[PDB]
Design a binder for this molecule. Structure first.
Ligand SMILES: C[S@@+](CC[C@H](N)C(=O)[O-])C[C@H]1O[C@@H](n2cnc3c(N)ncnc32)[C@H](O)[C@@H]1O
Length: 219
């Protein structure tokens, strides 16, 4: 098919691209994309917009509440941060993003959506120092995500929930993510209270991208 992002078509509009990006008509790859009330400015030539993650972005929108402080550890241009900040209206969301280009757009997007409860941080989340401030932490990343749990447990309050993503073989999809969480919980002085595992999309033959919603309290 063909993805229409903002005024840009990926294969009338402003311009269109071929996906490693080649221009087929025009010069400008930057646009503002509107999804479920939210505006996302990005350069479609240097920032990818994932079709298959739409359901999770919709789910994150209302996952919080006005009593919460939320840390988004892999914020990007604000895929989760923006909807969550708008529809859950938490007290505050720390949106950490390591890549300077994606960070630029995270910054524009907070402004575009007129959000006053978001603080963007340009950094590797492992370098950020936010002790015991988070009611909720989102880990939307699938590359050795478990290696980041030591940090997410630092962020977490005495009690809170982590949204942990992993890609995992179907056979152990309800097992491995959980044992990893329990290992790092104990490592950091927390214990697992309850959890739920949800599928997000087939990541590869036999392998699922999953998200586990897990609640912890320390001791
Ligand atoms: C943009 S999200 C992808 C989400 C999904 N593709 C979607 O469309 O909803 C992943 C982001 O995490 C960022 N990232 C990777 N490692 C990081 C780290 N250690 N600390 C903070 N951000 C990181 C990457 O730059 C990337 O922008």
């Amino acid at each position: 098919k063909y993805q229409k992002i903002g005024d840009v078509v990926i294969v009338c509009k402003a311009i269109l691209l071929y996906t490693h990006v080649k221009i087929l008509y025009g010069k400008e790859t930057e646009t503002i994309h509107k999804e479920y009330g939210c505006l996302f400015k990005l350069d479609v030539a240097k920032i990818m917009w994932s079709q298959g993650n739409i359901e999770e972005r919709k789910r994150m929108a209302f996952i919080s509440n006005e009593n919460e402080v939320v840390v988004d550890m892999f914020a990007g241009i604000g895929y989760f941060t923006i909807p969550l900040a708008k529809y859950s209206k938490p007290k505050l969301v720390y949106a950490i993003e390591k890549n300077p280009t994606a960070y630029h757009y995270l910054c524009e997007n907070i402004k575009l959506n007129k959000l006053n409860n978001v603080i963007p941080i340009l950094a590797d989340n492992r370098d950020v120092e936010l002790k015991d401030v988070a009611d909720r932490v989102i880990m939307g990343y699938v590359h050795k995500t478990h290696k980041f749990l030591d940090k997410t447990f630092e962020f977490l309050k005495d009690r809170g929930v982590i949204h942990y993503h992993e890609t995992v073989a179907e056979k152990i999809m309800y097992e491995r993510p959980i044992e990893r969480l329990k290992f790092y919980a104990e490592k950091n002085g927390y214990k697992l209270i309850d959890y739920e595992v949800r599928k997000i999309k087939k990541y590869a033959p036999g392998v699922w991208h999953v998200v586990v919603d897990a609640k912890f309290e320390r001791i």
